[PDB]
Amino acid sequence: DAAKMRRFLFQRTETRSTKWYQIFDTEKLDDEQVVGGHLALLGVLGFIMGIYYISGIQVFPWGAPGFHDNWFYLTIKPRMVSLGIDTYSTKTADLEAAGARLLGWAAFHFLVGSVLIFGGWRHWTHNLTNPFTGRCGNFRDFRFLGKFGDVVFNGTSAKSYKEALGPHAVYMSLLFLGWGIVMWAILGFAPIPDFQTINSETFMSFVFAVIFFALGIYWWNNPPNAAIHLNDDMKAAFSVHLTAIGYINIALGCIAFVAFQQPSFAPYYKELDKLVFYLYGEPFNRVSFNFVEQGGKVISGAKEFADFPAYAILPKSGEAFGMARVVTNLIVFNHIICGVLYVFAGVYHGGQYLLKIQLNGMYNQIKSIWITKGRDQEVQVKILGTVMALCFATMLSVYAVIVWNTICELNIFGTNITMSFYWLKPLPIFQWMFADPSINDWVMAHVITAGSLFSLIALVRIAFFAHTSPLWDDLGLKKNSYSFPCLGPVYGGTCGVSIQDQLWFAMLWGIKGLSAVCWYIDGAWIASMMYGVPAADAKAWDSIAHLHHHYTSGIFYYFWTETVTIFSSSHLSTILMIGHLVWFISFAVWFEDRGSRLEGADIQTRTIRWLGKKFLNRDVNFRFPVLTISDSKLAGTFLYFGGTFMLVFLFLANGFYQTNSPLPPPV
Amino acid sequence: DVTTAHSDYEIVLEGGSSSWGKVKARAKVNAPPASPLLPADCDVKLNVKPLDPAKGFVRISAVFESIVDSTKNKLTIEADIANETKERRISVGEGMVSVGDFSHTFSFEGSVVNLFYYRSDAVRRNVPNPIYMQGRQFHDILMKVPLDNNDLIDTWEGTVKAIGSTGAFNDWIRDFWFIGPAFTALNEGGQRISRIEVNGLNTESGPKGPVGVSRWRFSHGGSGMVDSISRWAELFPSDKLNRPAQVEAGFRSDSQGIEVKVDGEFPGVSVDAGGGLRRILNHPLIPLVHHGMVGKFNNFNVDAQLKVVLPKGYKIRYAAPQYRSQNLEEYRWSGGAYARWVEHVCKGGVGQFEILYAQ
Amino acid sequence: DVTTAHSDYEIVLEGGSSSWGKVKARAKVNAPPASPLLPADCDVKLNVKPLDPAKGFVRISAVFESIVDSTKNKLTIEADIANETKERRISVGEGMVSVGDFSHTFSFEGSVVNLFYYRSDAVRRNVPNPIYMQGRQFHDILMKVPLDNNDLIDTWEGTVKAIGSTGAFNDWIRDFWFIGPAFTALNEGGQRISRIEVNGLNTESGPKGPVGVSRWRFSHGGSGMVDSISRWAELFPSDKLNRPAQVEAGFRSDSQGIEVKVDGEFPGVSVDAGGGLRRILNHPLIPLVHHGMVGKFNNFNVDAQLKVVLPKGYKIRYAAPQYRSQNLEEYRWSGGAYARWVEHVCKGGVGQFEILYAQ
Ligand code: BCL
Ligand code: BCL
Ligand code: BCL
Ligand code: BCL
Ligand code: BCL
Ligand code: BCL
Ligand code: CLA
Ligand SMILES: CCCCCCCCCCCCCCCC(=O)OC[C@@H](CO[C@H]1O[C@@H](CO)[C@H](O)[C@@H](O)[C@@H]1O)OC(=O)CCCCCCCCCCCCCCC
Ligand SMILES: CCCCCCCCCCCCCCCC(=O)OC[C@H](COP(=O)(O)OC[C@@H](O)CO)OC(=O)CCCCCCCCCCCCCCC
Ligand code: SF4
Ligand SMILES: [Ca+2]
């Protein structure tokens, strides 16, 4: 039975094979299918966007009660208020009129989404036939909306990616102009060019439509020759776009933090502090053990509050819970974690293409300064050498400051908070970047600098060591593959050497700076691991450094304070248990025990065969499966990263509890 | 306002020792042809059938149906080419030449000899893929055209008179044999046409009517560029002709442009490349060098797709320019590097595009 | 569809009677090379050292290190060229030719004679700067290659046999000497290669092993375009070689493109132009006419900068195309007319660009 048993392990091996999570890969799809897939998802995205609109209705058009508050719509409510579809009004009439508008935009997105899905099926199946005029169209050569195509594109379509830039830019100016008309005609916002009103978003919707159209014609006549090697392969271009989109998303996250709490954005974001929100899963009106409410009601029982019915979600004061910043932290963090994730994948899917060329030898044939200036091994170890040195001199300079501040605050080794770095704060030149600048701001800048250079090491290694490294050229070895776990025990072992594993060590290392953001935007103290504890000098910070605000907690005391509100909620606490349960299970597949599970699975499948035969008359052969290391490090990073930030949501959605009253010394 | 040309290519190959491949090519161009007479249209048909395996003989046919400036022109050939030795190759065949209301038939007994100036082991050893091989070819021709028409007789009488009175007939006949720009094509492909030699010009009676007979012999040398000389063994896969092979093509041309259709199977599309690896046959150099002659007159934009289909279990080990997309068994070339190489080779470039596919 | 090529140039000249100039050139092109084998890389080194002023003899060296389709190819030359008279120039030198695992050495005793069909005073008087001079060159060659390898012997035996059996060896050797596209280049530069003449093919014993010896002599004529004939005195500034001069260059080529680096000092960069005015040496015509052969296959956009540095006190009297900008003694060319002239001369044009700088 050895052979049959081996045909199975062979059915689950570390060698190249087809996997369910690689079927929509760029390699097996032509350029007509990428366009078709993007269209079908935007149709689904419109269907999704139309559900975030129906959910926002508080009172239905017929006047009856609607939906309870939910986080999906909350992150978009300040935008629909800004555009006039949604309105913050106590009057039930405004609440009933508003609901009709959201329902109308939801049905509209249902119609347009259905068109994009239809226009995404025919493109995918190359069945792009006009149902009215029997004649079909050509992807390579088409008129592009008839007469409009002839005047601007000389009646021709782009045959190469570098050419598609001009037409794509022209298509963008038709959206910039298209939105500038929707705002003017449907939403009633005329283009007044003053940057304190929503009317400025129509004026710049036309300025941008002019810049892009002019820029889209210059690239039609003069397509850029930069990164020509990308025009040859889809994944090469798709990865540079993803490395670019991630920095774009991080930028969007950073401006939505500065802007959403500007005075001009007060009518939409700060305005929320004066609203009562019934969030789902929040503590409801409790009832007694012997509580039976019959037709007569309130008989032979008792209930909590008595100002609301049994099992009804209780109100929540926006000012107390800090709703404004909670929403501002949920949007800013979303576009930052995603931005970081996009950058990591751009480098991964990019080095995934650098491996394909090194194997085929096209690497030495590239002429772009974007690859040529990076094929020298001496130059690589210099770039990586400086990145590692900078990462070290900055992770040790800022960690020792945080540790020293912690030691001074806890009076360890007879040291008072006076000897700590309370005098160190950002220089005067940078003081404009921060409100009430302090050591909490000097540390955060250096932590992000150290947290970027740390995860950059794993990225420079994907870019430079996809096929070979100075060590494996020394050890005479080839990295044939992007997802190979290790070469075995040899040379003290060589686990985690592929670029997919280096991607994992960028996501795992990126959890620190991805947490220095969560902690810093929630008004937490980052200069000390212990701030505000009932101990020696933790509460002396607000007056030793003269801070205008009072931070919620320090790195360690953050978990205790922020979770007082999590434990009070029956749903925020379910996330705390699920999120922790998912995270530890990563250790089972990330620890070097893949072999043990396999011999264990053998005993599992042997015992089941034994029990089934001794009890029943049938033969139970299930051949218990076990994941491979590369398949383990995959699921391991998804359980680790995916459970780590299932709970970061709880820190941001539990409320914003930074104040404006610095504490006096606990003298 | 801007010229454009569209084209589609396709190669399907079998596995094992088979060199059999199916090739389909469709092209459409918007610039005027260099031909000083338009419209000129043309359909060509080639069929090769193996007669016997041991002899190595094969029967090849060719039909040309072209209308040039409303003048119907047809040339028909039926011949029996076989391998005699490594350098000699004898062909016996018959054909017909018709222009408008004029037509004449011919029968030929011919042999071609091909020698390489040198044959060194070091080249062979040090070179994995040799492109240029220096050589020369010698044709023995015994033409048999019956003088049925009044005009044929006059062309023959005139020819004999010209030979008799002009000493420079062997030299100045090369000005007639290569008419208009075909003569400039000679220097272009690095091909030298030597002077013809007339063994005999004797009229011999035939059952139908007097038959002018010519027995001539000529030679021509290739600097290495010429494919007939450099690749003498590869252009005749007679022994690989297990089943009949046909190449069918045609084209339409006029002031507006050229429309071309080509299709057919034949062996020799795939050749061994060493180390167990197979490879598509090296592109013929003479066609590219000959098309650069007419392809450099109009600035054009290239829209070409090359679909290559490989055998089950057979994947490519290396290609430059690299395939834009892969889809299971088939691999696709379009855009980017490939549509630079097409603009390169459509204007006369001969840059290498190599595909290596191993089992 | 247009690709981009980037280039930078630099000429630094000294004052007085010095003809010494430093030339640096960098180029980068994105179109495939015409070479039917890729990738093909190549590094070249030239060094000239004056042996003695009175004799006028100089020692010239040349090293070629080129990898062609993974085949290492190296040619080495060391020679002693000196001026005998106005038309004769004798050279004595040794060299080595290695391809992969094959290598063979050679020793040569040679003289080149250069005559102008006419030498008229009126042409000199009425034309201040003549370009075309009609002429012919004659090479006397005494090659000495030891037959160390099994292959050398066979190449020699074969050669002798070929001469013995083929009357047309003097003619058909020109089809071998100029392989592939080299044959076409002859007609292109208006250069006629005459038939070689074999004085003797005798094997003479050497201390190492049998030494095949060839004593041959050939000629070649230039309609005026050829620079070796039209400019025989200018390409050998032996007497101006006060100090050693070196020209170092190299290039990388493949399917994607070409990268070229060139640098070195040598005399003759500046020549008297009359009326006390100096001028950069007239561009060689043969390189331009030879590059138009491969430069006309891909539409390209030109990005070229030519930085010229003059001696202290030395200012341009006239340039067309005019320098875009000036920086005290340094003058710059980029864009506008100059990047039209570059597009002109990179495709085979030979249009004049003249700089006159007087003290
Ligand atoms: C998560 C960390 C990395 C990541 C790591 C990986 C890994 C690991 C793999 C891929 C693979 C793929 N990636 Mg990636 N990838 C990320 C971000 C992206 C993004 C993006 C949203 O910006 C896109 C469009 C892509 C695109 C793609 C395709 C080229 C390819 C096959 C997709 C597939 O079949 O999924 C599965 C199809 C489904 C319908 C499941 C749901 C997928 C949803 C739609 C999300 C797509 C992106 C996601 C990461 C895909 C892989 C999920 C696996 C569980 C890891 N990646 C980030 C940066 N990517 C595979 C490949 O062939 O790489 C060369 C592969 O092995
Ligand atoms: C074009 C380059 C060479 C040339 C190349 C060859 C080659 C190669 C050989 C011949 C040989 C022959 N040549 Mg020759 N020949 C040329 C010039 C001439 C001229 C002339 C008008 O000047 C004449 C009269 C001949 C005469 C002859 C015949 C005696 C003999 C057989 C011809 C035949 O059957 O064609 C058939 C009639 C046709 C119209 C066929 C045309 C085919 C074209 C050229 C290529 C088609 C193949 C296509 C690319 C791939 C198709 C695959 C299909 C399976 C067919 N040659 C020039 C100088 N010649 C053959 C021999 O060795 O005989 C012993 C042979 O193998
Ligand atoms: C290319 C155009 C001409 C040509 C031009 C010349 C010129 C000009 C002269 C020679 C002369 C000679 N020729 Mg010749 N020669 C040609 C063809 C040949 C062939 C052949 C393979 O067919 C042979 C065997 C020879 C043989 C010879 C030698 C006997 C002799 C010295 C060569 C030498 O040392 O080169 C050295 C080996 C090298 C590889 C050098 C290559 C140099 C290249 C061509 C130019 C480099 C200079 C660069 C532009 C500027 C550099 C400045 C630095 C200071 C060097 N010639 C063709 C037909 N020949 C010389 C003579 O007169 O002898 C008495 C000489 O002056
Ligand atoms: C396209 C797929 C879906 C869809 C999905 C979404 C999504 C997703 C969102 C909306 C949202 C909105 N949609 Mg909708 N929507 C669709 C179809 C429509 C149509 C229509 C013409 O059919 C209309 C009128 C609307 C109307 C609207 C508004 C009610 C609302 C705000 C739009 C906005 O800000 O635009 C402004 C638009 C532009 C200026 C157009 C161009 C955008 C440019 C090209 C990209 C910006 C990012 C760029 C990368 C930045 C960096 C620069 C780089 C250098 C390039 N939708 C279809 C059905 N809809 C938003 C919402 O509800 O917010 C709360 C929202 O986020
Ligand atoms: C949101 C709409 C999606 C889309 C969804 C559809 C739909 C829906 C249909 C097609 C179909 C067609 N698609 Mg599509 N497709 C998109 C993008 C493109 C692009 C491109 C790269 O820009 C091209 C060249 C094509 C090509 C083609 C046509 C050749 C084909 C024609 C039959 C028909 O009914 O035609 C009319 C169209 C043409 C003759 C082509 C010229 C006009 C433009 C390009 C058509 C697409 C819509 C247009 C861009 C929308 C407005 C954009 C504004 C900026 C707001 N599509 C756009 C972005 N596609 C048809 C099909 O699959 O039938 C089964 C079809 O009905
Ligand atoms: C006393 C010097 C302190 C320090 C004090 C400050 C101050 C003060 C400011 C910054 C600020 C910044 N710091 Mg700091 N910074 C240090 C070291 C670093 C290192 C590093 C790993 O070497 C990095 C990458 C950064 C990064 C940055 C940027 C976020 C920002 C840039 C302006 C600036 O530094 O202006 C001022 C820079 C200088 C006065 C001199 C910089 C000296 C260089 C950079 C290296 C110092 C020596 C090195 C650390 C030796 C340590 C070796 C170890 C013992 C192994 N700092 C050392 C530890 N930094 C600004 C900001 O916005 O903060 C929020 C700011 O106001
Ligand atoms: C909750 C976590 C958890 C669970 C259920 C298991 C379970 C198991 N481990 Mg693992 N393991 C874990 C964590 C866990 N481990 C961690 C963190 C590590 C790293 C140190 C390891 C390292 C490891 C090694 C090295 C090996 C195993 C092996 C085994 C198996 C042998 C024990 C057995 O037969 O029955 C034990 C009893 C049960 C499984 C009863 C079931 C318990 C609950 C009901 C399971 C269902 C709950 C689950 C979490 C639901 C998921 C919900 C989702 C939202 C996440 C068993 C399937 C051995 C084996 O044979 O591999 C196949 C083996 O060699 N363990
Ligand atoms: C994967 C690894 C990386 C993970 C991803 C990191 C990307 C995020 C990128 C950092 C940006 C964070 C984003 C949120 C924006 C935000 O917060 O902006 C406002 C402002 C403070 O606002 C107020 O915040 C209150 C909260 O307590 C305070 O109490 C108050 O006093 C203060 O005024 O913050 C800064 O100025 C930003 C500091 C960081 C300074 C950046 C320095 C980096 C620049 C130099 C080089 C770094 C890159 C090196 C190369 C890798
Ligand atoms: C009589 C003999 C007794 C033996 C009979 C039965 C033995 C026990 C078998 C059943 C008990 C095992 C139950 C769990 C036991 C257990 O915990 O095993 C941990 C498991 C490790 O699997 P192994 O490779 O060890 O294979 C185990 C099998 O052999 C089953 O026995 O971890 C993962 O699978 C990672 C998760 C993959 C998915 C990653 C997704 C990432 C995002 C997360 C999103 C939400 C997660 C939901 C996804 C599902
Ligand atoms: S335990 Fe895993 S990572 Fe470590 S040597 Fe073994 S296979 Fe490699
Ligand atoms: Ca909080």
From Swiss-Prot, chains B, C:
**What is a GO molecular function of this protein?**
metal ion binding
Residues given in the record as bacteriochlorophyll a 7 binding sites: 290
The domain of life for this entry's organism is Bacteria
Keyword terms? Bacteriochlorophyll, Chlorophyll, Chromophore, Electron transport, Magnesium, Metal-binding, Photosynthesis, Reaction center, Transport
Q: What processes does the entry annotate via GO biological process terms?
A: photosynthesis
Record: residues binding bacteriochlorophyll a 6: 139
- Binding, bacteriochlorophyll a 3: 291
Q: Which residues bind bacteriochlorophyll a 1?
A: 104
Listed binding positions for bacteriochlorophyll a 4 are: 283
One Pfam family assigned to this protein is BChl_A
Q: Which InterPro entries match?
A: BChl_A, Chl_A_sf
Stored SUPFAM superfamilies? Bacteriochlorophyll A protein
Q: What does this protein do?
A: Intermediary in the transfer of excitation energy from the chlorophyll to the reaction centers.
**Subunit structure of this chain's protein:** Homotrimer. Each subunit contains 7 molecules of bacteriochlorophyll a.
- Name used for this protein in its record: Bacteriochlorophyll a protein
Q: List the source organism.
A: Chlorobaculum tepidum (strain ATCC 49652 / DSM 12025 / NBRC 103806 / TLS) (Chlorobium tepidum)
Q: What is the lineage of its organism?
A: Bacteria, Pseudomonadati, Chlorobiota, Chlorobiia, Chlorobiales
Q: Which gene encodes it?
A: fmoA
